[PDB]
Design a binder for this molecule. Sequence first.
Ligand SMILES: *[C@](=O)([C]([C][C][C][N][C]([N])[N])[N]C(=O)[C]([N]C(=O)[C]([C][C][C][N]C([N])=O)[N]C(=O)[N][C]([C])C1=[C][C]=C(Br)[C]=[C]1)[C]([C])[C])C1=N[C]=[C]S1
Length: 237
Amino acid sequence: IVGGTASVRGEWPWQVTLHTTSPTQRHLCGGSIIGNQWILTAAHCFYGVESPKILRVYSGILNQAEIAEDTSFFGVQEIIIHDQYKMAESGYDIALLKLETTVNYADSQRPISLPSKGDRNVIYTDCWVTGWGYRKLRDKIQNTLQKAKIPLVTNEECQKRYRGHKITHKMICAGYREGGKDACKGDSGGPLSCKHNEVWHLVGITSWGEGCAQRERPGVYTNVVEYVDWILEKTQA
Ligand SMILES: *[C@](=O)([C]([C][C][C][N][C]([N])[N])[N]C(=O)[C]([N]C(=O)[C]([C][C][C][N]C([N])=O)[N]C(=O)[N][C]([C])C1=[C][C]=C(Br)[C]=[C]1)[C]([C])[C])C1=N[C]=[C]S1
C-alpha cells in the first residue's frame, strides 16, 4: 500500500495474508474471508503454483512478525480459478480458496459481506484498500498491515487513464487524480472494502495498475458484484 498508514489490530478482520512455503515461506498475496471455509482472492496470484499444498492462510494478523513456525494457519484444500481467467489485465482476476478446516469467527477474524446486485447504483464514499504490499515500487513486504482511503472512479474515467487497455464493467477502479495513495506489489488479492450504511462490503479485489500511486493511473480491481453468481455456484457443494 502506497501512502497509507498502519492499521489498528482487528480493524479489517476479513483480511488474510496468503503465504507460500516454496522455496521458503513468504507472503504471497492478500485475501478476504467470505465464508467459514472460503477465501476470495485474485487468480493471477497463483502463477507458478502447481499445488495448494504449499499455501498457508493466516487470519487475524496485523504484523507479519506474528507469523512464526509455531503459528497456526489454515491449509488450502482447493484453488478455484475462474475458467475465463487468462491474465489480470484482461479481467476475471478472481479465485476462491477452499480451506481444509473451518474458520472460527471472532473479533479478530470474521467474514466480509459480498455486495448485492441491488447495489451497483450505490455511491460508496468510504472505500479503503489494505494489505502488506509494497510502499513503493522497489520496496518489500511491509510488516504492519497498511490501509489507505481511496475514492472510486467511474469506468469511463478509468478507461481514459488506460488507453491501451480495455476497462470492462467487470473491473472497477479507485485512485486520486494526483496519485499518492494506491495498492502495490503484494497487495494483490486484497480487498477493496467499502462502508455503505454502517456495513462493510467487499467491492473489489486488488488486481493491477500501471506502477503504483502514479498520477492519472487509478488502481484497477475486480468488480466483485459481477461475480456473486459465480461465487455462489463455486461455493455450493
Ligand atoms: C499484486 O500485489 C500486484 C498489485 C498491483 C496493484 N497496482 C496498483 N497500482 N493499484 N499486481 C501485479 O503486480 C500485476 N501486474 C501489474 O500490476 C503491472 C501491470 C502493468 C500494465 N501497464 C500498462 N500500462 O499496460 N505489471 C507489472 O508491474 N509488471 C512488472 C514486471 C512487475 C515487477 C515486480 C512485481 Br512484484 C510484479 C510485477 C501482476 C503481474 C499480475 C502482485 N501480484 C504478484 C506480485 S505482486
